[PDB]
Specification:
The structure is a homodimer. Chain A is of the alpha/beta class. Chain A has one domain: TIM Barrel. The first copy, chain A, contains 9 helices and 10 strands. In chain A, strand 6, helix 4 and strand 7 form a beta-alpha-beta unit.
């Protein structure tokens, strides 16, 4: 039902066999450096390794000058030591450029090319997939779903104008951003609508406020709630989920896949 | 959307506010008695209490002569010490009679009145809700879903003929019974069809072989897989889930409910 694969330079991701798991890398920085140090980069490599062991298919790694000094070294190490595609979690054009240069395969923009349109040009240039997330600096919606789909389309426009191929575009409803708890639930309820745009969807709900708002539970107690959102997401056609708890979420996805027939 | 409530003598269960959780009681018997002993009944009371604390709305308690001697004492204790409705998990008419006499509120038949039709008469008599599960002594299906719906309807017929009111009937697809792993998945995939019959559905997939078959994981490692089935089940309209891991499953249900708008 996807007539193509995701091309990620060295690695290739099939969109039909299974829900693809993107693991969120623990990024705890050192307080005694401006980036690159041994505890920093080593703790990140061991985390990537752990996530790779537990079922992850992608490792997600997230002022401007410092951001490069911190993130670049982590990409060099992980790409060497863990054979998995890497996404850079930035919205900044300059940051994205460095990260791909450093070895990152996918861009993960939380502003869907709206914060720094030049990022699209970076993406088209290096010919890497880009995840466009719904976002906005206000919460005033006429019709939440209709508006989201409009807003995302404004991102696709920017991406395509810059020269990004349809096949390198992935969408993200941006659950947990610019949405009240009730709005987040509504988007969850209506996720399948994003499918009409005809692009792979990545869901990213891992331990967010709205899960806490529902269950009344702090961040470290949101594995079950996250799981529910992952399940409903997969049912509604998501090609990727972005999660912290890779072992557990990887098992729920696999079971979902078997049931829905993916 | 349900224009009525479940009447359970002392307790009343609303079918619209939330997915109702039925907790599976640990029933470990004593090897030095034929039923009733202190370690037996006390370990069961503490388990019911634990499940009541973790979010359960119902406690499920499961030759003929001995079955009564073992199960009756557990119902007397739990109904006294835990203020929750109780279901007796039997298919035997004589057993069901005793259990309701002992204080059980709901019947949970794994043969949908087909093993002992008299059980329907017991249910109509005491005017208690009855859960009719799909089951059969063979695995030869022409059309799995079509056949299940036929078979269940043969149960409803028996129940109604015996005098059971429509409002005291609950259905159960019987996942994990008389079905190959692939058939179990198929039923999971097509669960919403059971809705056309117009009765509340209870799902009972807690840690079964097919979850293990998919994930390749032993019984004690099936919480995530169980969770996936609970999520998909709730999405497909289930009013109840029957589970071991009450704390976790209760949280996933609650989150599902918020998302689907229940």
């Amino acid at each position: 039902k996807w007539d193509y694969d995701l091309r990620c330079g060295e690695y290739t991701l099939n969109l039909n066999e299974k829900t693809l798991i993107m693991g969120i890398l623990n990024v705890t920085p050192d307080s005694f450096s401006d980036g690159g140090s041994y505890n920093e980069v080593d703790a990140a490599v061991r985390h990537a390794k752990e996530m790779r062991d537990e079922g992850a298919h992608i490792i997600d790694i997230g002022s401007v000058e410092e951001e490069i000094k911190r993130v670049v070294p982590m990409i060099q190490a992980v790409s060497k030591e863990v054979k998995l595609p890497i996404s850079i979690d930035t919205y900044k054009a300059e940051v994205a450029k460095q990260a791909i240069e450093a070895g990152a395969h996918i861009i993960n923009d939380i502003w869907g090319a709206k914060a720094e349109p030049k990022i699209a040009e970076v993406a088209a240039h290096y010919d890497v997939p880009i995840i466009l997330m719904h976002n906005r600096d206000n919460m005033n919606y006429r019709n939440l779903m209709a508006d989201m789909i409009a807003d995302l389309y404004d991102s696709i426009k920017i991406a395509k104008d810059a020269g990004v191929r349809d096949e390198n575009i992935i969408l993200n409803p941006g659950i947990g951003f610019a949405k009240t708890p009730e709005q987040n639930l509504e988007a969850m309820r209506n996720l399948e609508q994003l499918n009409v745009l005809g692009y792979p969807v990545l869901l990213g709900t891992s331990r967010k406020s709205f899960i806490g708002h529902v269950l009344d539970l702090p961040v470290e107690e949101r594995l079950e709630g996250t799981g529910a959102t992952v399940c409903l997401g997969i049912e509604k056609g998501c090609e990727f989920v972005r999660v912290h708890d890779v072992k557990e979420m990887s098992r729920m996805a696999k079971m979902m896949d078997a049931m829905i027939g993916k």
